[PDB]
Amino acid sequence: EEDKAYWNKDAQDALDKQLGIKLREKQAKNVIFFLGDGMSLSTVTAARIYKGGLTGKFEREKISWEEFDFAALSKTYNTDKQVTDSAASATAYLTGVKTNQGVIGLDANTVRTNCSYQLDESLFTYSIAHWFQEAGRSTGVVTSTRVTHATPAGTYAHVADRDWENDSDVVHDREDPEICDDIAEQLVFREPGKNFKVIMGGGRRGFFPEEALDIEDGIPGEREDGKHLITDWLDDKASQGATASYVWNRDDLLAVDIRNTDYLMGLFSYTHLDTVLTRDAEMDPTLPEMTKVAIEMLTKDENGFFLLVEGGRIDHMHHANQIRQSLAETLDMEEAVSMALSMTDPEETIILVTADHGHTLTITGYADRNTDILDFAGISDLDDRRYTILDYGSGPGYHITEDGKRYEPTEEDLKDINFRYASAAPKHSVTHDGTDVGIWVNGPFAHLFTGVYEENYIPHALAYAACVGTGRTFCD
Amino acid sequence: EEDKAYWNKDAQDALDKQLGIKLREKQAKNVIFFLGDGMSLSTVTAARIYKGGLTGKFEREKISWEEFDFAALSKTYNTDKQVTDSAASATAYLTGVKTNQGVIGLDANTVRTNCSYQLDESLFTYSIAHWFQEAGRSTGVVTSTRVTHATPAGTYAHVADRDWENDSDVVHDREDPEICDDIAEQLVFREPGKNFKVIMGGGRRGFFPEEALDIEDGIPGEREDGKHLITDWLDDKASQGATASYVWNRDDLLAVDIRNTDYLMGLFSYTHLDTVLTRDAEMDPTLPEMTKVAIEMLTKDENGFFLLVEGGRIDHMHHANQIRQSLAETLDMEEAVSMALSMTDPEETIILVTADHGHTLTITGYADRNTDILDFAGISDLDDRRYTILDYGSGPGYHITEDGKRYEPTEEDLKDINFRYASAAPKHSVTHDGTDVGIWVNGPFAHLFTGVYEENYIPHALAYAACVGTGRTFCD
Numbered sequence A, B: 001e002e003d004k005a006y007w008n009k010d011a012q013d014a015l016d017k018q019l020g021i022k023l024r025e026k027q028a029k030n031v032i033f034f035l036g037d038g039m040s041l042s043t044v045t046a047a048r049i050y051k052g053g054l055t056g057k058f059e060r061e062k063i064s065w066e067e068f069d070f071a072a073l074s075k076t077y078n079t080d081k082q083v084t085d086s087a088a089s090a091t092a093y094l095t096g097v098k099t100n101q102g103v104i105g106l107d108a109n110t111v112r113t114n115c116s117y118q119l120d121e122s123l124f125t126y127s128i129a130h131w132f133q134e135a136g137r138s139t140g141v142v143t144s145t146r147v148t149h150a151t152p153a154g155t156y157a158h159v160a161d162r163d164w165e166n167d168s169d170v171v172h173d174r175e176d177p178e179i180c181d182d183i184a185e186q187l188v189f190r191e192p193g194k195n196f197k198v199i200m201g202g203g204r205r206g207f208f209p210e211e212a213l214d215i216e217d218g219i220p221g222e223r224e225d226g227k228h229l230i231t232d233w234l235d236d237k238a239s240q241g242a243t244a245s246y247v248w249n250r251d252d253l254l255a256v257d258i259r260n261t262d263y264l265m266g267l268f269s270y271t272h273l274d275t276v277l278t279r280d281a282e283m284d285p286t287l288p289e290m291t292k293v294a295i296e297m298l299t300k301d302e303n304g305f306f307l308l309v310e311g312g313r314i315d316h317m318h319h320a321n322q323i324r325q326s327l328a329e330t331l332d333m334e335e336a337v338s339m340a341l342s343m344t345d346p347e348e349t350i351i352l353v354t355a356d357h358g359h360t361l362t363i364t365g366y367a368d369r370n371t372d373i374l375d376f377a378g379i380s381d382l383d384d385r386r387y388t389i390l391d392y393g394s395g396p397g398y399h400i401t402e403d404g405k406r407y408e409p410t411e412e413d414l415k416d417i418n419f420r421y422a423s424a425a426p427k428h429s430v431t432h433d434g435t436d437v438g439i440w441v442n443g444p445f446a447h448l449f450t451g452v453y454e455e456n457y458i459p460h461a462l463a464y465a466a467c468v469g470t471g472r473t474f475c476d
């Protein structure tokens, strides 16, 4: 059992592992950046125990990226808010500069929602993908969200409001769609987006007009400027003499001819991809399946590549206080990191996992070891009503019953994938959490991540190791 | 302002600092171990912003131990509970073995509250203070809690229930005080406690009987066996030919003759010491003042020393959801680390800061940069009532008004040092939180703390760097 000799051997071994660490002081060829949107340290702990429940190891289970020797903390406050949104944080960890709430790829001079600031080049921050391209290397993005959402957008767009995913969004804010480029336009017509070898995720809707109908669903598009950006993208690649493929389901993705495909656009939903627990496994590729194909394509570039993979709906599930779903999203991303580890060489590939910000998830006491993380924890000594292990500081989970008592979750509630666990402060969408988030790194220069950093440090460190961009460099 | 150039220089400097790290691969002569009881990562972030509010730096401020280059994460589950108490965690991080809820210094064979198990030497786990003693080096302990409380007790005691601080506690559990040694007894009559050079904190009550009255307050003691343990402690020291001092107030501590004093017992309260915001600064020494004298005493040992300093009422305040007091307790500990750093030599002294377990504190959005961390964050779009930036997943803060609405905190509330910030799940005493906690380290072999570790790894790593104990060692 877990007795004295057991823990002592457990510690001495972790000690041996730690004394056996070999530093990797060699250039990074490849960088694969995983981003769990909203993935607080409490999400990671709870997901570890959730995973353990599936495997039978329970609290002793390990999350794949926790096998890395280097972890660090990341401070996420931005230029105007203590609790950052997904846009300003992406600008920090992908372009190296902190910024204002709702702004992508522009500095804190920006006034949110005012398109004029996205016309001023001096205010532009440039992404690590931009740097990889400037260096003659390939770039790609994979996400479970719309490919125009804040996180992926951070690798290529410069907009004064992250809501401006397509031209209908710009118009909704009374800005001029003729001069205010939306994110979907930027991905297809401007750098670095137009040079991405791989683009996968959701958001077909932002790429074709109201007059046209969606592949698969036949839902009218959102564009109001008549542009058919997917065909524009396909034509552009063809006119360059390259082979390009556009796919929208799992079988077609898996059937892609990797050796002969130069460019791959895979858009698997009109909107964000379906969540792990609701998706049709036949029609939707999983995060690890996208990750795999992406790596397969990008690794043809012998000079190296940068790929962003986002576990994006972790955040959306937490916003609704839908903790069961949030944990399943998280593990989809944990399995993708394992996919990436198994396919690449650590003497040449940095795998970095982080979060853009947290969520107000907490893990309360005092359930026994091996208890399902999503179960009840006990009964309250104040109102004699049950409470769950997991709960939140903010969100719609807060519930005063008709007779003015605290809602008591039931056993049916716990199993319901749409059940909202309790919060302390009611809100229609839970707020993000301002606590520092984790960073975990493996590969070349993984030891540049030991302490506590400003979130914007990340890419500057990554550029040093990869030898890209205009800052201090390993090759320098 | 915080524009593009600003953030880029910020990151390049942090990068320069990182590339300048020099490893310390030399033996540790000294080990100073700071333990923030219940000091979750969210507590550290919130305390960082709280400190900034005092210094005018706000979210840009840095906690002293955040200047260290090495941080790591610690997994705190124990052998029977997902969310650990202070007793089992202390056993883990001070003796290197995880154990059952409520148990100190025995392994998981122990059945809580069954004294028989504390009679079986084969189930004993030994503390890093024991190991320093065995190596001919000095040891001490400083805390804001009773000196018999779980945390300090982890350095010396072996009991089947952490409630057994004095004999009256043992009797209350129907165990035999004659053969079931309470914690206060063990500190004075058994090793390693009898050999500590320094003992500071509170809890005089556990050391003298009901028939006797407290120095200072004249409160009858708790002991029911007539023992006067302080005079037993003094007499033991004198009969060894050593000088000893017993002090109970700040003036007297500060007046202690350091060069001529071999042993120091400073007990400043009948019970736990008063909280930072309620203490009488003339009568009670601060956590940094204790730390200073402790180091002054223990550094006379040319062979080295181990010192535990606990910021212990962080936890007690969180239990009541009293967040304002928790943050002041935390900063008292932050200032002690600065005191320790300003007095010792990093080529020879490890300073490690960690928590035993967290608390369910969250940092909600969306207040502006520079907003007082303890202020309101905004108004709920569900019930049109204010909510605070800080709140908890568990505790007595949950409050449904008489008319069945969500209590609305007032401006008066926020300034009241006894006001209980809102929780999501009502409980008389908030539960601890199961989320991983931080570790931050400086000095020799600080680079043994880089990733993610079981909480019991800590002392094994510390022993290696200090060359103590029976495990793998740097001197080996």
Ligand SMILES: *[C@@H]1O[C@H](CO)[C@@H](O)[C@H](O)[C@H]1NC(C)=O
Binding pocket: A114, A115, A116, A117
């Ligand atoms: C948007 O910014 C421009 C550019 O300086 C300014 O002239 C204009 O009035 C701003 N709009 C608003 C609504 O503040």
Ligand SMILES: *[C@@H]1O[C@H](CO)[C@@H](O)[C@H](O)[C@H]1NC(C)=O
Binding pocket: B114, B115, B116, B117
């Ligand atoms: C306590 O432990 C002893 C020692 O093995 C055992 O004989 C005794 O019955 C136990 N007491 C309880 C309450 O189980």
Ligand SMILES: [Mg+2]
Binding pocket: A037, A086, A145, A149, A150, A151, A152, A310, A312, A315
């Ligand atoms: Mg996202």
Ligand SMILES: [Mg+2]
Binding pocket: B037, B086, B145, B149, B150, B151, B152, B310, B312, B315
């Ligand atoms: Mg304690």
Ligand SMILES: [Zn+2]
Binding pocket: A037, A038, A085, A086, A087, A315, A356, A357
């Ligand atoms: Zn986000």
Ligand SMILES: [Zn+2]
Binding pocket: A038, A086, A315, A316, A319, A432
């Ligand atoms: Zn969000």
Ligand SMILES: [Zn+2]
Binding pocket: B037, B038, B085, B086, B087, B315, B356, B357
């Ligand atoms: Zn504790």
Ligand SMILES: [Zn+2]
Binding pocket: B038, B086, B315, B316, B319, B432
């Ligand atoms: Zn506690």
